[model samples]
Target: SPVRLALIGAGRWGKNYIRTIAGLPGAALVRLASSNPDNLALVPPGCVIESDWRSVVSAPEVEAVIIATPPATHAEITLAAIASGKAVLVEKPLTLDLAEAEAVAAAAKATGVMVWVEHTQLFNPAWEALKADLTSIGPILAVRSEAGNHGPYRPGGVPMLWDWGAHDVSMVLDLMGRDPDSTSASWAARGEKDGGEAGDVTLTLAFSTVEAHIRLCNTMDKCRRLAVFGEAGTLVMDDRATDKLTLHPPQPDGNWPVGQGHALTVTDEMPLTRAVRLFAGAVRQPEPGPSPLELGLRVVRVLGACS
Candidate 1:
Protein backbone atom coordinates (compact mmCIF):
# COMPACT_ATOMS: atom_id res chain seq x y z
CA SER A 1 0.00 0.00 0.00
CA PRO A 2 1.23 3.49 -0.80
CA VAL A 3 1.98 5.97 1.97
CA ARG A 4 -0.70 8.64 1.73
CA LEU A 5 0.73 12.19 1.80
CA ALA A 6 -1.00 15.47 2.63
CA LEU A 7 0.98 18.43 1.30
CA ILE A 8 0.42 22.02 2.45
CA GLY A 9 1.16 25.47 0.98
CA ALA A 10 0.70 24.55 -2.67
CA GLY A 11 2.55 27.53 -4.04
CA ARG A 12 5.80 27.91 -6.01
CA TRP A 13 7.86 25.09 -4.47
CA GLY A 14 4.96 23.21 -2.90
CA LYS A 15 3.58 22.48 -6.35
CA ASN A 16 6.86 20.81 -7.22
CA TYR A 17 6.52 18.48 -4.23
CA ILE A 18 2.90 17.77 -5.18
CA ARG A 19 3.87 16.76 -8.70
CA THR A 20 6.95 14.85 -7.58
CA ILE A 21 5.21 12.94 -4.80
CA ALA A 22 2.36 12.02 -7.13
CA GLY A 23 4.77 10.15 -9.40
CA LEU A 24 6.68 8.31 -6.69
CA PRO A 25 5.77 4.63 -6.43
CA GLY A 26 5.28 4.24 -2.69
CA ALA A 27 3.51 7.54 -2.09
CA ALA A 28 0.18 9.08 -3.10
CA LEU A 29 -0.70 12.79 -2.93
CA VAL A 30 -4.12 12.35 -1.34
CA ARG A 31 -4.75 15.90 -0.13
CA LEU A 32 -3.59 19.26 -1.42
CA ALA A 33 -3.67 22.11 1.13
CA SER A 34 -3.35 25.78 0.24
CA SER A 35 -5.04 29.15 0.74
CA ASN A 36 -4.42 30.22 -2.81
CA PRO A 37 -7.55 29.37 -4.81
CA ASP A 38 -5.49 29.97 -7.92
CA ASN A 39 -3.37 26.94 -7.12
CA LEU A 40 -6.41 24.65 -7.06
CA ALA A 41 -6.26 24.49 -10.82
CA LEU A 42 -2.70 23.18 -10.62
CA VAL A 43 -3.87 19.94 -9.00
CA PRO A 44 -4.68 16.91 -11.11
CA PRO A 45 -8.25 16.27 -12.09
CA GLY A 46 -10.29 14.55 -9.35
CA CYS A 47 -7.63 14.99 -6.65
CA VAL A 48 -8.58 16.29 -3.20
CA ILE A 49 -7.78 20.00 -2.79
CA GLU A 50 -8.70 22.38 -0.01
CA SER A 51 -8.21 26.01 1.05
CA ASP A 52 -7.67 25.39 4.74
CA TRP A 53 -4.44 23.48 5.64
CA ARG A 54 -5.86 22.36 8.98
CA SER A 55 -8.45 20.24 7.19
CA VAL A 56 -5.79 18.39 5.21
CA VAL A 57 -3.82 17.54 8.32
CA SER A 58 -6.85 16.09 10.06
CA ALA A 59 -7.96 14.06 7.06
CA PRO A 60 -7.93 10.31 7.76
CA GLU A 61 -6.37 9.59 4.40
CA VAL A 62 -3.16 11.45 5.16
CA GLU A 63 -0.46 9.27 6.66
CA ALA A 64 2.35 11.71 6.04
CA VAL A 65 2.65 15.47 5.54
CA ILE A 66 4.89 17.41 3.20
CA ILE A 67 5.17 21.13 4.01
CA ALA A 68 6.56 23.57 1.49
CA THR A 69 5.25 26.63 3.20
CA PRO A 70 6.89 29.83 4.40
CA PRO A 71 9.74 29.53 6.88
CA ALA A 72 7.70 31.18 9.59
CA THR A 73 4.92 28.59 9.36
CA HIS A 74 7.18 25.52 9.11
CA ALA A 75 7.67 24.95 12.83
CA GLU A 76 3.97 25.19 13.57
CA ILE A 77 2.75 22.82 10.85
CA THR A 78 5.66 20.44 11.36
CA LEU A 79 5.08 20.26 15.10
CA ALA A 80 1.40 19.58 14.50
CA ALA A 81 2.22 16.79 12.07
CA ILE A 82 4.72 15.26 14.48
CA ALA A 83 2.18 15.32 17.32
CA SER A 84 -0.27 13.55 15.03
CA GLY A 85 2.43 10.88 14.51
CA LYS A 86 2.72 11.48 10.80
CA ALA A 87 6.05 11.51 9.02
CA VAL A 88 6.96 15.01 7.82
CA LEU A 89 9.27 16.70 5.34
CA VAL A 90 9.26 20.47 5.71
CA GLU A 91 11.07 22.74 3.33
CA LYS A 92 14.37 24.09 4.66
CA PRO A 93 15.50 26.77 7.10
CA LEU A 94 12.90 25.05 9.29
CA THR A 95 11.80 28.34 10.85
CA LEU A 96 12.30 32.01 10.24
CA ASP A 97 13.92 32.20 13.67
CA LEU A 98 16.19 29.82 15.57
CA ALA A 99 14.14 29.80 18.78
CA GLU A 100 11.22 28.25 16.91
CA ALA A 101 13.53 25.73 15.34
CA GLU A 102 14.76 24.60 18.76
CA ALA A 103 11.25 24.32 20.11
CA VAL A 104 10.09 22.19 17.17
CA ALA A 105 13.14 19.94 17.47
CA ALA A 106 12.53 19.36 21.17
CA ALA A 107 8.88 18.50 20.59
CA ALA A 108 9.57 16.12 17.73
CA LYS A 109 12.28 14.36 19.71
CA ALA A 110 9.91 13.93 22.60
CA THR A 111 7.25 12.47 20.33
CA GLY A 112 9.55 10.05 18.47
CA VAL A 113 8.16 11.14 15.12
CA MET A 114 10.01 11.27 11.80
CA VAL A 115 10.95 14.62 10.23
CA TRP A 116 12.98 15.46 7.11
CA VAL A 117 13.91 18.98 6.05
CA GLU A 118 13.96 19.68 2.32
CA HIS A 119 17.61 20.57 2.00
CA THR A 120 17.55 19.20 -1.53
CA GLN A 121 21.27 19.77 -2.06
CA LEU A 122 22.01 16.86 0.24
CA PHE A 123 20.42 14.54 -2.29
CA ASN A 124 22.59 15.76 -5.16
CA PRO A 125 24.73 13.10 -6.87
CA ALA A 126 28.08 14.88 -6.71
CA TRP A 127 27.60 15.82 -3.06
CA GLU A 128 26.50 12.30 -2.10
CA ALA A 129 29.49 10.83 -3.91
CA LEU A 130 31.62 13.56 -2.39
CA LYS A 131 30.58 12.42 1.07
CA ALA A 132 32.27 9.08 0.39
CA ASP A 133 35.35 10.63 -1.18
CA LEU A 134 36.05 12.93 1.77
CA THR A 135 39.06 10.88 2.86
CA SER A 136 40.59 11.30 -0.60
CA ILE A 137 39.99 15.04 -0.41
CA GLY A 138 42.31 15.18 2.60
CA PRO A 139 41.70 16.28 6.22
CA ILE A 140 38.80 18.61 5.30
CA LEU A 141 40.16 21.83 6.59
CA ALA A 142 37.62 24.07 4.88
CA VAL A 143 34.66 24.17 2.50
CA ARG A 144 33.40 27.09 0.39
CA SER A 145 30.00 27.18 -1.24
CA GLU A 146 27.95 29.81 -3.09
CA ALA A 147 24.40 30.12 -4.45
CA GLY A 148 22.92 33.17 -6.17
CA ASN A 149 19.63 34.04 -7.82
CA HIS A 150 18.17 37.09 -9.48
CA GLY A 151 15.41 38.46 -7.31
CA PRO A 152 13.12 41.44 -6.83
CA TYR A 153 9.86 39.66 -7.43
CA ARG A 154 10.67 36.35 -5.72
CA PRO A 155 8.60 35.36 -2.70
CA GLY A 156 9.61 35.31 1.01
CA GLY A 157 10.49 39.01 1.38
CA VAL A 158 13.67 39.18 -0.75
CA PRO A 159 16.59 39.31 1.73
CA MET A 160 17.59 36.01 0.08
CA LEU A 161 19.18 34.56 3.23
CA TRP A 162 16.02 32.96 4.55
CA ASP A 163 14.92 32.47 0.97
CA TRP A 164 17.97 30.66 -0.52
CA GLY A 165 20.81 30.65 2.03
CA ALA A 166 19.16 27.79 3.90
CA HIS A 167 20.01 25.28 1.18
CA ASP A 168 23.75 26.02 0.93
CA VAL A 169 24.27 26.56 4.65
CA SER A 170 22.39 23.35 5.43
CA MET A 171 24.37 21.42 2.84
CA VAL A 172 27.65 22.78 4.19
CA LEU A 173 26.71 21.63 7.68
CA ASP A 174 25.72 18.20 6.36
CA LEU A 175 29.02 17.82 4.55
CA MET A 176 31.20 19.02 7.44
CA GLY A 177 29.76 16.41 9.84
CA ARG A 178 29.71 18.97 12.63
CA ASP A 179 27.00 21.14 14.03
CA PRO A 180 27.64 24.87 13.86
CA ASP A 181 28.58 26.76 16.97
CA SER A 182 27.67 30.28 15.78
CA THR A 183 27.48 32.35 12.63
CA SER A 184 29.06 35.68 11.63
CA ALA A 185 27.39 37.33 8.68
CA SER A 186 28.58 40.24 6.45
CA TRP A 187 26.21 42.04 4.12
CA ALA A 188 25.84 45.00 1.73
CA ALA A 189 22.60 46.65 0.58
CA ARG A 190 21.27 48.67 -2.36
CA GLY A 191 19.78 51.66 -0.49
CA GLU A 192 16.04 51.45 0.38
CA LYS A 193 15.44 49.42 -2.75
CA ASP A 194 16.86 46.35 -0.96
CA GLY A 195 15.17 47.15 2.38
CA GLY A 196 18.44 47.54 4.33
CA GLU A 197 19.06 43.84 3.82
CA ALA A 198 22.22 42.99 1.97
CA GLY A 199 21.66 42.21 -1.66
CA ASP A 200 24.55 39.81 -1.11
CA VAL A 201 25.79 38.24 2.10
CA THR A 202 28.31 35.69 3.26
CA LEU A 203 27.80 33.42 6.26
CA THR A 204 30.71 31.90 8.11
CA LEU A 205 30.18 28.94 10.41
CA ALA A 206 32.62 27.63 12.96
CA PHE A 207 32.89 23.89 13.42
CA SER A 208 35.29 21.94 15.65
CA THR A 209 38.27 22.14 13.31
CA VAL A 210 36.95 23.40 9.96
CA GLU A 211 35.27 26.55 8.72
CA ALA A 212 32.42 26.48 6.20
CA HIS A 213 31.67 29.63 4.28
CA ILE A 214 28.37 30.04 2.44
CA ARG A 215 27.75 32.99 0.16
CA LEU A 216 24.29 33.92 -1.13
CA CYS A 217 22.96 36.76 -3.27
CA ASN A 218 19.64 38.05 -4.62
CA THR A 219 21.09 40.74 -6.83
CA MET A 220 23.39 38.80 -9.13
CA ASP A 221 23.41 36.25 -11.94
CA LYS A 222 21.94 33.14 -10.37
CA CYS A 223 23.73 29.82 -10.04
CA ARG A 224 23.68 26.85 -7.64
CA ARG A 225 27.09 25.49 -6.78
CA LEU A 226 29.18 23.79 -4.09
CA ALA A 227 32.98 23.86 -3.90
CA VAL A 228 34.84 21.49 -1.56
CA PHE A 229 38.49 22.09 -0.83
CA GLY A 230 40.81 19.78 1.05
CA GLU A 231 44.56 19.37 1.25
CA ALA A 232 44.52 16.59 -1.35
CA GLY A 233 42.16 18.04 -3.99
CA THR A 234 39.00 20.04 -4.60
CA LEU A 235 35.70 19.06 -6.21
CA VAL A 236 32.85 21.20 -7.55
CA MET A 237 29.22 20.34 -8.29
CA ASP A 238 28.09 22.74 -10.99
CA ASP A 239 24.39 22.25 -11.72
CA ARG A 240 21.67 19.66 -11.27
CA ALA A 241 20.77 19.94 -14.93
CA THR A 242 24.23 18.70 -15.97
CA ASP A 243 24.75 16.49 -12.90
CA LYS A 244 28.50 16.88 -13.19
CA LEU A 245 31.23 16.75 -10.54
CA THR A 246 34.59 18.23 -11.38
CA LEU A 247 37.80 17.39 -9.57
CA HIS A 248 40.91 19.52 -9.43
CA PRO A 249 43.75 17.34 -8.23
CA PRO A 250 46.11 18.60 -5.55
CA GLN A 251 49.66 19.31 -6.56
CA PRO A 252 52.32 16.67 -5.94
CA ASP A 253 54.69 17.18 -2.97
CA GLY A 254 52.61 20.21 -1.94
CA ASN A 255 53.67 22.15 -5.00
CA TRP A 256 51.26 24.07 -7.25
CA PRO A 257 50.45 23.03 -10.85
CA VAL A 258 52.34 19.71 -10.60
CA GLY A 259 49.23 17.72 -11.55
CA GLN A 260 46.48 18.21 -14.10
CA GLY A 261 44.44 21.30 -13.14
CA HIS A 262 41.01 19.80 -13.60
CA ALA A 263 39.14 16.56 -14.33
CA LEU A 264 35.40 15.92 -14.54
CA THR A 265 32.92 13.10 -13.81
CA VAL A 266 29.17 13.03 -14.25
CA THR A 267 26.67 11.00 -12.27
CA ASP A 268 23.86 9.25 -14.16
CA GLU A 269 20.99 9.68 -11.72
CA MET A 270 18.28 12.35 -11.65
CA PRO A 271 18.67 13.89 -8.17
CA LEU A 272 15.16 15.32 -7.92
CA THR A 273 13.41 12.04 -8.70
CA ARG A 274 15.91 10.16 -6.54
CA ALA A 275 15.38 12.47 -3.55
CA VAL A 276 11.58 12.37 -3.83
CA ARG A 277 11.69 8.60 -4.16
CA LEU A 278 13.96 8.47 -1.11
CA PHE A 279 11.30 10.22 0.96
CA ALA A 280 8.72 7.79 -0.35
CA GLY A 281 10.86 4.76 0.49
CA ALA A 282 11.55 6.07 3.96
CA VAL A 283 7.85 6.50 4.50
CA ARG A 284 7.17 2.93 3.40
CA GLN A 285 9.64 1.44 5.87
CA PRO A 286 8.68 0.99 9.50
CA GLU A 287 11.67 3.00 10.70
CA PRO A 288 11.72 6.66 9.66
CA GLY A 289 14.77 7.97 7.78
CA PRO A 290 15.66 11.67 8.31
CA SER A 291 13.59 14.03 10.41
CA PRO A 292 12.85 17.56 9.37
CA LEU A 293 13.12 18.50 13.02
CA GLU A 294 16.74 17.47 13.19
CA LEU A 295 17.80 19.13 9.91
CA GLY A 296 15.68 22.19 10.65
CA LEU A 297 17.28 22.66 14.05
CA ARG A 298 20.76 22.98 12.62
CA VAL A 299 19.65 25.35 9.86
CA VAL A 300 17.60 27.49 12.23
CA ARG A 301 20.43 27.64 14.72
CA VAL A 302 22.69 29.18 12.15
CA LEU A 303 20.04 31.36 10.57
CA GLY A 304 18.85 32.65 13.89
CA ALA A 305 22.38 33.39 14.94
CA CYS A 306 22.97 35.30 11.73
CA SER A 307 19.64 37.08 11.86
Candidate 2:
Protein backbone atom coordinates (compact mmCIF):
# COMPACT_ATOMS: atom_id res chain seq x y z
CA SER A 1 0.00 0.00 0.00
CA PRO A 2 1.20 3.47 -0.81
CA VAL A 3 2.02 5.67 2.19
CA ARG A 4 -0.15 8.58 1.16
CA LEU A 5 0.64 12.01 2.63
CA ALA A 6 -1.58 15.06 3.12
CA LEU A 7 0.34 18.31 3.50
CA ILE A 8 -1.29 21.08 5.55
CA GLY A 9 -0.41 24.74 5.14
CA ALA A 10 1.25 25.08 1.74
CA GLY A 11 2.98 28.31 2.76
CA ARG A 12 6.72 28.81 3.17
CA TRP A 13 7.58 25.75 5.26
CA GLY A 14 4.90 23.61 3.65
CA LYS A 15 6.30 24.28 0.20
CA ASN A 16 9.66 22.94 1.37
CA TYR A 17 7.86 19.87 2.69
CA ILE A 18 6.27 19.30 -0.72
CA ARG A 19 9.66 19.65 -2.40
CA THR A 20 11.32 17.20 -0.07
CA ILE A 21 8.43 14.74 0.37
CA ALA A 22 7.74 14.69 -3.35
CA GLY A 23 11.30 13.43 -3.69
CA LEU A 24 11.13 10.90 -0.87
CA PRO A 25 11.14 7.25 -1.87
CA GLY A 26 8.12 5.01 -1.19
CA ALA A 27 5.96 7.93 -0.12
CA ALA A 28 3.41 9.87 -2.19
CA LEU A 29 2.31 13.47 -1.76
CA VAL A 30 -1.34 12.65 -2.22
CA ARG A 31 -3.00 15.88 -1.05
CA LEU A 32 -2.35 19.53 -0.25
CA ALA A 33 -4.31 21.86 2.07
CA SER A 34 -3.76 25.59 2.56
CA SER A 35 -6.09 28.43 3.48
CA ASN A 36 -4.33 30.89 1.18
CA PRO A 37 -5.01 30.89 -2.56
CA ASP A 38 -1.49 32.15 -3.20
CA ASN A 39 0.00 28.99 -1.75
CA LEU A 40 -2.46 26.78 -3.66
CA ALA A 41 -0.69 27.86 -6.84
CA LEU A 42 2.53 26.25 -5.58
CA VAL A 43 1.15 22.71 -5.28
CA PRO A 44 2.40 20.04 -7.61
CA PRO A 45 0.35 19.38 -10.73
CA GLY A 46 -2.56 16.86 -10.42
CA CYS A 47 -2.37 16.69 -6.61
CA VAL A 48 -5.51 17.48 -4.59
CA ILE A 49 -5.53 20.95 -3.00
CA GLU A 50 -8.06 22.39 -0.57
CA SER A 51 -8.48 25.44 1.68
CA ASP A 52 -9.25 23.90 5.06
CA TRP A 53 -7.13 21.22 6.77
CA ARG A 54 -10.20 19.13 7.68
CA SER A 55 -10.69 18.46 3.97
CA VAL A 56 -7.28 16.86 3.81
CA VAL A 57 -7.29 15.28 7.28
CA SER A 58 -10.57 13.47 6.71
CA ALA A 59 -9.74 12.27 3.24
CA PRO A 60 -9.55 8.48 3.10
CA GLU A 61 -6.69 8.63 0.63
CA VAL A 62 -4.42 10.54 3.00
CA GLU A 63 -2.80 7.87 5.16
CA ALA A 64 -0.78 10.47 7.09
CA VAL A 65 -0.69 14.25 7.56
CA ILE A 66 2.09 16.79 7.95
CA ILE A 67 0.95 19.92 9.82
CA ALA A 68 2.90 23.09 9.02
CA THR A 69 0.28 25.56 10.08
CA PRO A 70 0.91 28.46 12.47
CA PRO A 71 1.99 27.46 15.97
CA ALA A 72 -1.37 28.34 17.45
CA THR A 73 -3.32 25.70 15.49
CA HIS A 74 -0.73 22.92 15.71
CA ALA A 75 -2.43 21.07 18.57
CA GLU A 76 -5.90 21.05 17.04
CA ILE A 77 -4.82 19.81 13.61
CA THR A 78 -2.40 17.31 15.10
CA LEU A 79 -4.99 15.89 17.50
CA ALA A 80 -7.50 15.69 14.68
CA ALA A 81 -5.07 13.79 12.49
CA ILE A 82 -4.21 11.41 15.31
CA ALA A 83 -7.89 10.75 16.07
CA SER A 84 -8.36 10.06 12.38
CA GLY A 85 -5.72 7.32 12.65
CA LYS A 86 -3.17 9.10 10.49
CA ALA A 87 0.45 9.54 11.50
CA VAL A 88 1.52 13.16 11.87
CA LEU A 89 4.69 15.22 11.61
CA VAL A 90 4.29 18.69 13.08
CA GLU A 91 6.60 21.68 12.88
CA LYS A 92 8.68 22.65 15.91
CA PRO A 93 7.55 23.99 19.30
CA LEU A 94 4.74 21.47 18.95
CA THR A 95 2.59 23.77 20.98
CA LEU A 96 2.95 27.45 21.76
CA ASP A 97 2.36 26.37 25.38
CA LEU A 98 3.12 23.29 27.46
CA ALA A 99 -0.39 22.57 28.75
CA GLU A 100 -1.66 22.25 25.18
CA ALA A 101 1.35 20.17 24.26
CA GLU A 102 0.68 17.79 27.15
CA ALA A 103 -2.97 17.39 26.22
CA VAL A 104 -2.24 16.66 22.57
CA ALA A 105 0.46 14.18 23.48
CA ALA A 106 -1.90 12.34 25.77
CA ALA A 107 -4.48 12.12 23.02
CA ALA A 108 -1.96 10.72 20.56
CA LYS A 109 -0.89 8.14 23.10
CA ALA A 110 -4.47 7.08 23.73
CA THR A 111 -5.13 6.77 20.01
CA GLY A 112 -1.90 4.88 19.29
CA VAL A 113 -0.74 7.33 16.66
CA MET A 114 2.77 7.97 15.44
CA VAL A 115 3.63 11.63 15.96
CA TRP A 116 7.02 13.17 15.09
CA VAL A 117 8.42 16.67 15.35
CA GLU A 118 10.90 18.34 12.99
CA HIS A 119 13.98 18.21 15.17
CA THR A 120 15.89 17.75 11.93
CA GLN A 121 19.39 18.58 13.04
CA LEU A 122 19.47 15.52 15.25
CA PHE A 123 19.30 13.36 12.16
CA ASN A 124 21.83 15.36 10.11
CA PRO A 125 24.71 13.36 8.68
CA ALA A 126 27.25 15.62 10.36
CA TRP A 127 25.59 15.12 13.72
CA GLU A 128 25.30 11.42 13.02
CA ALA A 129 29.01 11.28 12.27
CA LEU A 130 29.72 13.10 15.50
CA LYS A 131 27.48 10.70 17.40
CA ALA A 132 29.55 7.86 16.06
CA ASP A 133 32.94 9.47 16.75
CA LEU A 134 32.10 10.99 20.13
CA THR A 135 34.91 9.04 21.73
CA SER A 136 37.41 10.26 19.14
CA ILE A 137 37.66 13.54 21.07
CA GLY A 138 37.47 11.89 24.46
CA PRO A 139 34.79 13.00 27.00
CA ILE A 140 32.60 15.99 26.31
CA LEU A 141 32.81 18.90 28.79
CA ALA A 142 31.06 21.91 27.25
CA VAL A 143 29.01 22.83 24.18
CA ARG A 144 28.19 26.08 22.31
CA SER A 145 25.88 26.49 19.31
CA GLU A 146 24.24 29.72 18.07
CA ALA A 147 22.29 30.57 14.94
CA GLY A 148 20.31 33.54 13.57
CA ASN A 149 19.63 35.53 10.39
CA HIS A 150 18.17 38.79 9.16
CA GLY A 151 14.56 38.93 7.99
CA PRO A 152 11.68 36.88 9.43
CA TYR A 153 11.21 39.67 11.90
CA ARG A 154 8.50 39.35 14.53
CA PRO A 155 5.01 40.19 13.38
CA GLY A 156 3.12 42.59 15.69
CA GLY A 157 1.95 39.83 18.05
CA VAL A 158 4.75 37.27 17.84
CA PRO A 159 7.73 37.42 20.17
CA MET A 160 11.36 37.09 19.04
CA LEU A 161 11.80 33.83 20.95
CA TRP A 162 9.14 31.96 18.97
CA ASP A 163 10.52 33.17 15.66
CA TRP A 164 14.27 32.34 15.73
CA GLY A 165 14.47 30.91 19.22
CA ALA A 166 12.58 27.75 18.28
CA HIS A 167 15.19 26.47 15.83
CA ASP A 168 18.22 27.31 17.99
CA VAL A 169 16.56 26.00 21.14
CA SER A 170 15.63 22.70 19.51
CA MET A 171 19.11 22.26 18.09
CA VAL A 172 20.63 22.96 21.49
CA LEU A 173 18.30 20.54 23.20
CA ASP A 174 18.98 17.76 20.74
CA LEU A 175 22.76 18.25 20.90
CA MET A 176 22.83 18.30 24.67
CA GLY A 177 20.38 15.44 25.21
CA ARG A 178 16.99 15.68 26.97
CA ASP A 179 18.10 16.41 30.52
CA PRO A 180 18.89 20.01 31.53
CA ASP A 181 19.66 20.27 35.24
CA SER A 182 19.23 24.02 35.53
CA THR A 183 18.84 26.85 33.03
CA SER A 184 19.20 30.63 33.52
CA ALA A 185 18.41 32.86 30.55
CA SER A 186 18.04 36.63 30.02
CA TRP A 187 17.28 38.76 26.94
CA ALA A 188 17.78 42.45 26.09
CA ALA A 189 16.27 44.72 23.45
CA ARG A 190 17.48 47.87 21.66
CA GLY A 191 14.27 49.31 20.20
CA GLU A 192 12.08 51.97 21.83
CA LYS A 193 9.58 49.58 23.36
CA ASP A 194 12.27 46.97 23.47
CA GLY A 195 15.70 46.62 21.93
CA GLY A 196 15.65 46.66 18.15
CA GLU A 197 13.30 44.11 16.60
CA ALA A 198 16.22 41.97 17.73
CA GLY A 199 18.40 41.99 20.78
CA ASP A 200 20.94 39.61 22.24
CA VAL A 201 19.90 36.48 24.20
CA THR A 202 22.36 34.74 26.43
CA LEU A 203 21.59 31.38 28.03
CA THR A 204 23.52 29.51 30.64
CA LEU A 205 22.43 25.88 30.71
CA ALA A 206 23.83 23.17 32.91
CA PHE A 207 23.68 19.39 33.01
CA SER A 208 24.92 17.09 35.76
CA THR A 209 28.56 17.30 34.70
CA VAL A 210 28.82 19.81 31.80
CA GLU A 211 27.91 23.42 31.10
CA ALA A 212 26.64 24.80 27.76
CA HIS A 213 26.18 28.42 26.70
CA ILE A 214 24.31 29.89 23.75
CA ARG A 215 24.62 33.53 22.62
CA LEU A 216 22.11 34.61 20.00
CA CYS A 217 21.70 37.79 17.94
CA ASN A 218 18.66 37.98 15.69
CA THR A 219 19.40 41.23 13.88
CA MET A 220 22.47 39.85 12.11
CA ASP A 221 23.35 38.00 8.96
CA LYS A 222 22.98 34.21 8.81
CA CYS A 223 25.38 32.40 11.09
CA ARG A 224 25.49 28.83 12.53
CA ARG A 225 28.25 27.16 14.45
CA LEU A 226 28.71 24.75 17.40
CA ALA A 227 31.70 23.64 19.41
CA VAL A 228 31.87 20.81 21.97
CA PHE A 229 34.56 20.72 24.66
CA GLY A 230 36.01 17.40 25.63
CA GLU A 231 38.55 16.35 28.16
CA ALA A 232 41.01 14.73 25.70
CA GLY A 233 40.09 16.98 22.74
CA THR A 234 37.42 19.28 21.29
CA LEU A 235 34.94 19.03 18.41
CA VAL A 236 34.08 22.16 16.45
CA MET A 237 31.59 22.36 13.61
CA ASP A 238 30.72 25.12 11.19
CA ASP A 239 27.50 23.35 10.24
CA ARG A 240 26.11 26.22 8.16
CA ALA A 241 29.04 27.30 5.99
CA THR A 242 31.27 24.35 5.10
CA ASP A 243 28.95 21.44 5.98
CA LYS A 244 31.97 20.03 7.79
CA LEU A 245 32.79 18.89 11.34
CA THR A 246 36.37 19.26 12.55
CA LEU A 247 37.92 17.47 15.47
CA HIS A 248 40.73 19.20 17.38
CA PRO A 249 42.38 16.62 19.60
CA PRO A 250 43.45 18.01 23.00
CA GLN A 251 47.03 18.73 23.90
CA PRO A 252 48.72 18.58 27.30
CA ASP A 253 48.61 22.39 27.52
CA GLY A 254 47.46 24.52 24.57
CA ASN A 255 45.05 27.18 23.36
CA TRP A 256 42.09 26.87 20.98
CA PRO A 257 42.47 27.78 17.23
CA VAL A 258 46.27 27.75 17.67
CA GLY A 259 46.73 24.39 19.41
CA GLN A 260 47.83 21.41 17.33
CA GLY A 261 45.16 18.70 16.99
CA HIS A 262 43.74 16.40 14.36
CA ALA A 263 40.81 17.46 12.18
CA LEU A 264 38.44 14.58 13.08
CA THR A 265 35.72 14.58 10.42
CA VAL A 266 32.21 15.79 9.47
CA THR A 267 29.41 14.79 7.13
CA ASP A 268 27.81 17.04 4.50
CA GLU A 269 24.19 15.87 4.53
CA MET A 270 21.91 18.81 5.24
CA PRO A 271 19.63 18.59 8.29
CA LEU A 272 16.65 19.77 6.27
CA THR A 273 17.28 16.91 3.89
CA ARG A 274 17.54 14.50 6.77
CA ALA A 275 14.32 15.80 8.33
CA VAL A 276 12.16 15.24 5.25
CA ARG A 277 13.69 11.86 4.52
CA LEU A 278 13.23 10.73 8.09
CA PHE A 279 9.61 11.83 8.12
CA ALA A 280 8.97 9.89 4.96
CA GLY A 281 10.66 6.83 6.42
CA ALA A 282 8.63 7.07 9.62
CA VAL A 283 5.37 7.31 7.69
CA ARG A 284 6.36 4.31 5.67
CA GLN A 285 7.25 2.12 8.68
CA PRO A 286 5.86 4.08 11.64
CA GLU A 287 7.98 2.34 14.23
CA PRO A 288 10.60 3.41 16.78
CA GLY A 289 10.28 7.08 15.83
CA PRO A 290 10.19 9.92 18.35
CA SER A 291 6.69 11.28 18.87
CA PRO A 292 5.54 14.91 18.84
CA LEU A 293 4.56 14.56 22.50
CA GLU A 294 8.02 13.68 23.82
CA LEU A 295 9.89 16.21 21.67
CA GLY A 296 7.39 19.08 21.86
CA LEU A 297 6.67 18.76 25.57
CA ARG A 298 10.37 18.99 26.37
CA VAL A 299 10.70 22.20 24.34
CA VAL A 300 7.63 23.60 26.04
CA ARG A 301 9.00 22.85 29.50
CA VAL A 302 12.25 24.72 28.88
CA LEU A 303 10.90 27.60 26.81
CA GLY A 304 7.89 27.99 29.07
CA ALA A 305 10.16 28.47 32.03
CA CYS A 306 11.97 31.25 30.18
CA SER A 307 8.81 33.31 29.91
User: Candidate 2: where are CA atoms >4 Å away?
Assistant: 36-38, 188-196, 239-243, 251-267, 290-292
lDDT of 1 by residue, 162-254 (tens): 767788777877776668776888875543343444377888898876777788876667687666777888766665434366666753332
Q: What is candidate 2's lDDT per residue for 19-93, written digit by digit as tens?
A: 677676767778888766766666667689776789888898888888888778889999889889998888876
For model 1, give the 10-residue run with minimal summed lDDT.
251-260
RMSD of 1: 3.4
What is the Å distance of residue 2 in model 2 from its true position?
A: 3.8
Query: In lDDT terms, how accurate is model 2?
Result: 0.71
Worst 10 residues of 2 by lDDT: 252-261
Relative to the true structure, candidate 1 reaches a TM of: 0.87
Per-candidate TM-score against the hidden true structure = 0.87, 0.88
In model 1, the runs with Cα more than 4 Å from the true position are 153-158, 188-190, 194-198, 240-243, 251-266, 286-292
